[PDB]
């Protein structure tokens, strides 16, 4: 009957299974989950500054369509487009639509710097029944519809603006594509318009095209929206003999620096989370996640797996 | 494990060990009792916590990205915008799968090492006064009261004390 001293290790009744290099199912005492699979279902307004267009997409907000009155001068870290956003104004298309909405979303600002232009020899502030603001004919709040002098000519526009500031100016303008040769002559008196916006280093010129388009808001015509950037020291020139949709100023090109747009339908709650997704916010300390590939902020890295168990204990052998 | 102590010559674990990860379990004249071992338990936890902290450092923070969902076919550009994201997700998924499997293989080997570490420490303590039964227990060839047992567990056991009794009981 000699004394014996034994050496061992702890164990538990129900252990956790983990993967290793040499086995798919090894039971260990304790393990932590590294893949986050849950979300709040609401977008947390902290610490990221959010902006809800909530009836207006970003571009409609930049142009100033009826619904987007609340978006003026807004600043954001994340703009939020909704699926319920609706066009409300004269029908328009935007060549390279995703590029101009990704410039407005990076800049993270709808601050419109208003400027006074002198469109010599044209009627101004035209409105359309397809763009109603309070049951009344309106237009884009940041665009000026120019038509011929009342019973007169479309005096040739040669307006210029020099960028004196230290920032890059983003000008939003457009070109009206009439529906019939009557409308063209009824509005600008030329048989064929022309819009040429230019800087010293880049230019763009458009001659409109008459024809029938599907009726949108009882309108068969269209407005093609364009944009021109102006660097400090450069000058922009709006030259047109017809069909010009003039600007009312410019936007300020800001720095990306957590500025983007997220297309979601979830309500903005009162929570706090440094990570947003299209499916809501993520609150976790885990490295990975299977919530959504769309992730904005300090987020876990999106993976395909739904569970990756890291072993935090020895081999469990009861 | 690479050392074959846990799930090896140590048959199974002790569920009565709730105050530590590694422990002693003796049988002397006065009776029987179990005590955890702090040093071995702490060394294992430090290396698990150490690799846990390494895996949490929040380094991923992007805001402006490329679109990852599309409401109309476009062709060349959309194909690329998709293929770029798919390529990234696959690579990160591999980076995660390999990380977990590798860290676990190391984790299990670390805990199997610390168990053998403790055993080898006690082996060197007695060092002619006991013998390795094989199951992780030492047959102490001398009377070892509770004060003697504690001396083995807090590292003050002087083998020269019992060397004369122990060798005699072993050889004959």
């Amino acid at each position, epitope marked *: 009957g000699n004394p014996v001293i034994c050496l061992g290790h*702890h164990a*538990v009744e129900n252990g956790t299974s983990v993967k290793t290099l040499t086995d798919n199912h090894i039971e260990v*005492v*304790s393990a932590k989950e590294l893949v986050e699979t849950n979300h709040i279902n609401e977008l947390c307004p902290s610490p990221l500054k959010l902006v809800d267009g909530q009836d207006c997409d970003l571009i409609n907000g930049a142009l100033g369509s009826p619904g987007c009155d609340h978006l003026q001068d807004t600043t954001w870290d994340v703009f939020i487009e909704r699926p319920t956003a609706m066009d409300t104004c004269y029908p328009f298309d935007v060549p390279d639509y995703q590029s101009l909405r990704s410039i407005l979303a990076s800049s993270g600002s709808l601050e419109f710097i208003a400027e006074q232009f002198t469109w010599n020899g044209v009627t101004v502030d035209g409105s359309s029944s397809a763009c109603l603001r309070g049951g009344r004919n309106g237009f884009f709040t940041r665009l000026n519809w120019l038509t011929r002098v009342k019973n007169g000519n479309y005096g040739p526009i040669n307006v210029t603006k020099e960028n004196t500031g230290s920032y890059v100016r983003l000008y939003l303008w457009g070109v009206h594509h009439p529906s019939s040769d009557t409308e063209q002559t009824d509005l600008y008196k030329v048989a064929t318009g022309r819009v040429t916006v230019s800087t010293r280093s880049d230019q763009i010129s458009i001659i409109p095209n008459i024809g029938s388009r599907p009726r949108v808001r009882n309108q068969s015509g269209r407005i093609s929206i364009y944009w021109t950037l102006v660097n400090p020291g450069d000058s922009i020139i709006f030259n047109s003999i017809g069909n010009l949709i003039a600007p009312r100023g410019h936007y300020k090109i800001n720095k990306s620096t957590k500025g983007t747009v997220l297309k979601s339908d979830k309500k903005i709650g009162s929570c706090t989370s440094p990570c947003l997704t299209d499916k809501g916010s993520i609150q976790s300390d885990k490295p990975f996640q299977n919530v959504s590939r769309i992730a904005i902020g300090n987020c876990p890295k999106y993976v395909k797996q739904g569970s990756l168990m890291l072993a*935090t*204990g020895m081999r469990n052998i009861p | 494990g690479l050392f074959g102590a846990i799930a090896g010559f140590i048959e199974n674990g002790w569920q009565g060990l*709730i*105050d*530590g*990860w590694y422990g002693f379990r003796h049988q002397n004249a006065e009776g029987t*009792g179990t*005590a*955890a071992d*702090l040093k071995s*338990t*702490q060394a294992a*936890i*430090d290396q*698990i*916590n*150490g690799k846990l*902290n390494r895996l949490i450092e929040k380094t991923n923070e992007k805001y402006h990205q490329i679109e990852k969902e599309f409401e109309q076919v476009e062709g060349r550009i959309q194909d690329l915008e998709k293929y770029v994201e798919d390529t990234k997700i696959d690579l990160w998924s591999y980076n995660a799968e390999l990380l977990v499997a590798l860290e676990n293989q190391h984790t299990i080997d670390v805990t199997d090492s610390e168990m053998n570490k403790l055993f080898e420490r006690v082996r060197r303590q007695l060092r002619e006064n006991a013998e390795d039964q094989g199951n992780g227990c030492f047959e102490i060839f001398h009377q070892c009261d509770n004060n003697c047992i504690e001396s083995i567990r807090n590292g003050t056991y002087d083998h020269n004390i019992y060397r004369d009794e122990a060798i005699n009981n072993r050889i004959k």
Partner: antibody, heavy 124, light 107 residues
Framework: QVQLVESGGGVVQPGRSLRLSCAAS????????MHWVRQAPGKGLEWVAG????????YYADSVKGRFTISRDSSKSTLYLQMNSLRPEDTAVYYC??????????????????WGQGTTVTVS | EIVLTQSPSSVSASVGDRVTITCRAT??????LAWYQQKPGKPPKLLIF???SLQSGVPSRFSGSGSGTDFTLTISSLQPEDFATYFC?????????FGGGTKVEIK
């Protein structure tokens, strides 16, 4: 829900004895080791005593070794701090504290999760 | 023993300042440090265990750092209720050591 209640603190003369008690509630007391930590009034926290889960291994501070005696009871789930040979150095606000459980083990040597309200011991 | 040394011993700051505190010991106490909050007349509350692991329910502004030799308790955006005295704890081996206290006053 889970908390620790202290008691026993009174006014006592040097050289005599007292017994302070710490009743647990809302957790498996007999599974955790436990600690007594005293905040000398004016100074910071000063660990004084600690005991294992079973009660066979007891750890004391060098200032109270052979003078104070810790003990516990599974049947009442209570922690006893039997103080003998008191002196004004031992004047302090006594706290019974619970070392944190880590991973799966209820270690005795860790940070302290739960504290009692604080029962003051005055020695004139 | 192991001797802890909190620096500074006291500090005054306004709400919203980047507060930094240090715990400083002798031995290799690996990663065993526990920071505590303490209001006057009240028992401590565990803020950080493992010297970096945030305690459950504690706001994310409290953060801990350090390993082995040099330790640090950082607070990003101080709040009115965060006015308190702070203690660090050694937990590598017995006996348990605490610090001299680092109180945050009003500026």
């Amino acid at each position: 829900q889970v908390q620790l209640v202290e008691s026993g603190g009174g006014v006592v003369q040097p050289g005599r004895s007292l017994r302070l008690s710490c009743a647990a509630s809302g957790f498996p007391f007999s599974s955790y080791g436990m600690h007594w930590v005293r905040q000398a009034p004016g100074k910071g926290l000063e660990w004084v005593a600690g005991v294992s889960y079973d009660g066979s291994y007891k750890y004391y501070a060098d200032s109270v070794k052979g003078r104070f005696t810790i003990s516990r009871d599974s049947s009442k789930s209570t922690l006893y701090l039997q103080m003998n040979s008191l002196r004004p150095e031992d004047t302090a606000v006594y706290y019974c504290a619970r070392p944190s459980a880590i991973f799966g083990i209820y270690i005795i040597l860790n940070g302290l999760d739960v504290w009692g309200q604080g029962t003051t011991v005055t020695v004139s | 023993e192991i001797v802890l040394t909190q620096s500074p011993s006291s500090v005054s700051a306004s709400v919203g300042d980047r507060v930094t505190i240090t715990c400083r010991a002798t031995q290799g106490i690996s990663s065993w440090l526990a920071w505590y909050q303490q209001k006057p007349g009240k028992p401590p509350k565990l803020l950080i265990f493992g010297a970096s692991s945030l305690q459950s329910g504690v706001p994310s502004r409290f953060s801990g750092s350090g390993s082995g030799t040099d330790f640090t308790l950082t607070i990003s955006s101080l709040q009115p209720e965060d006015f308190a005295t702070y203690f660090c704890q050694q937990a590598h081996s017995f006996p348990l050591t605490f610090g001299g206290g680092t109180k945050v006053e009003i500026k």
